[PDB]
């Protein structure tokens, strides 16, 4: 008989261990075994 | 005028590397062009 007020929050609490993928030397490739 | 932001930045991120002075034609093409004059 009592409907709770569904608030709109979503706690996440999850660190992603910040990235290190932009320093490296960069070259796109094609079909494998280059 | 010029937006200076073209969608041709796909290739500098990985596919290419800045400041390297790459050649415009592969050597195989150069030699192929050479003997094609003979």
Nearest chain B alpha carbon to A24: B14
Q: Give this entry's resolution in angstroms.
A: 4.5
Cβ B17–A27 below 8 Å, yes or no?
Answer: yes
Q: What Cα–Cα distance (Å) separates residue B37 from each residue in A29, B4, B31, B32?
A: 34, 41, 10, 9
- Smallest CA–CA separation between B15 and chain A, in Å? 4
Helices (H), B1-38: 10-13, 27-36
What the block records as the tokens of B16 is 């290419």
Q: Judge whether B14 is closer than 8 Å to chain A, CB to CB.
A: yes
Max CA pair span of chain B: 49
Cα gap A2→B27, rounded to integer Å: 79
Interchain CB distance below 8 Å, B17 and A25: yes
Q: How far apart, in whole angstroms, are the C-alpha atoms of residue B15 and residue A6?
A: 49
């Amino acid at each position: 008989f009592f409907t709770p007020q569904v608030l709109a929050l979503e706690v996440d609490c999850n660190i992603e261990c910040a990235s290190l993928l932009d320093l490296y030397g960069q070259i796109e490739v094609s079909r494998s075994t280059f | 005028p010029a937006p200076s932001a073209n969608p041709a930045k796909i290739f500098i991120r990985r596919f290419f590397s800045a400041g390297v002075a790459k050649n415009v034609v592969s050597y195989s093409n150069v030699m192929a062009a050479q003997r094609a004059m003979e």
